Design a protein around this motif. Sequence first.
Motif: not given
Lengths: 130, 133
Positions: B81-84, B101-104
């Motif tokens: 989970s993560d608030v992004c 993956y770092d960002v997508t």
Amino acid sequence: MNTAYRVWDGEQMHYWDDEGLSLIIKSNGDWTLKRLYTDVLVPVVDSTNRNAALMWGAKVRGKFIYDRSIVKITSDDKESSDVCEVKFSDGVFQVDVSKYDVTAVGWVEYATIEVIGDVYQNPELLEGVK
Amino acid sequence: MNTAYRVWDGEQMHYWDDEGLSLIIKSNGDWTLKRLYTDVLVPVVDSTNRNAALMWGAKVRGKFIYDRSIVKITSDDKESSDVCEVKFSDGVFQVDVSKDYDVTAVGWVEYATIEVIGDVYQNPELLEGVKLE
């Protein structure tokens, strides 16, 4: 700046920076390209015209792409090249990279992308390579 | 309709569909949020006010997403989970997935779910202290 856009009135292409042009998006989602002749704003084309089109520009590779046709040539040799139409969908400007299958145009890894036209002014370019 | 946008004028958020709002993009690249009162076009904000910000929207998974904060939660176990924050950069609405993956692309999130809970302008300091258990 996320302002780069271009409109196709049906006869010619219009770039946001063109002198006098101003784009106006309305509360109902409609859009309208306007030009400034004298001290009068003149309607050049408009979204209710089903032949017209509005394309946004993405800053990527220090450039601006929109909804063009491009030549994706592998950085390797001639190991890969193609003519694929740049589309804006799912929140990303993507291109066919079966030379994955789709990927951000600004995420093309082992390739170099060169804009050669657009689906409007080069309807035929998507064919017969050699 | 490639048209969804929202503008933060410094104090409140404005959505494209709000009655009478018209966004104006000028040739120099500047923009101006106008609003029609009776039948008089009245300005709301400019690109000049460096406090204000123009945020575009993209339709992904049926919903339109602008440049807000979301909570990516694994479609699997809650062992992810993560608030992004959703940033629109390089022609793609990317979002951190770091937690292969770092960002997508937000519309390309594969194994989890995305849920908007606010934005950087009306919910700053919404990216910390995070409970678990």
